Amino acid sequence: APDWVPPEVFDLVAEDKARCMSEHGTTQAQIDDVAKGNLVNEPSITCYMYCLLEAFSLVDDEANVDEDIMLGLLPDQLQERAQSVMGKCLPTSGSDNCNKIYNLAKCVQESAPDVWFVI
Amino acid sequence: APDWVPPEVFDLVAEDKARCMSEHGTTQAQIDDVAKGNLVNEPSITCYMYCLLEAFSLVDDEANVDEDIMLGLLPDQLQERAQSVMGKCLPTSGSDNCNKIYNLAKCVQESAPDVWFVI
């Protein structure tokens, strides 16, 4: 959604997007809501983000985030901004994997709301 | 730093200034360069401006400026000048939130460099 998101990621996520929305009952609208700062703690959306992250090997089975690869995949300017934010917001914490991702998403968005994007 | 900036603003912003400088690793020098017409597109300064704006609800999570909140903060002397420059420079456009504010800052500084103040 933010205008910085690399064109390539739209194609790259297309397979897992579909699998992850189906697995979690996600709708397009929930996704669109996020860019606008309207993230809700609902499994259809929070587990969807976990699902997408796992598909890119960015989380393990306990929603521990691979910070190095996550940051490495971001464009230059986002990477700089994310380094600080992710130092704060990582390691993840929460009651389950989906909540861990929600907490992370919310933590990032407090300071860098354009940095945590969902598609 | 321009002489028109209300005294009160220096105190109004002091809390959010410190937080924003700490969050973005901004130096006082970078802030002082801005009045001097030296703004560089560097997150340490561009995201600091975003941070301060957001802190007073002058921008949203997509770095779209609220024109009315902007004018509200501005003194009477500047209402007329500010409106004209905002007319030409708004809406914000750019890759990420920090670039949006950099682009706005450059646009304003092109005709009204003393309107874009940073503290």
Ligand SMILES: CCCCNS(=O)(=O)c1ccccc1
């Ligand atoms: C296909 C290679 C580009 C990936 N870059 S990204 O900004 O979309 C990104 C996606 C997910 C996590 C971090 C960064």
Ligand SMILES: CCCCNS(=O)(=O)c1ccccc1
């Ligand atoms: C900066 C990290 C953004 C991660 N957001 S996302 O989990 O919905 C996601 C988006 C795209 C690919 C994988 C995960």
Ligand SMILES: CCCCNS(=O)(=O)c1ccccc1
């Ligand atoms: C035209 C308005 C200037 C905005 N500049 S500033 O982002 O450093 C900022 C200064 C003071 C309060 C809020 C933001």
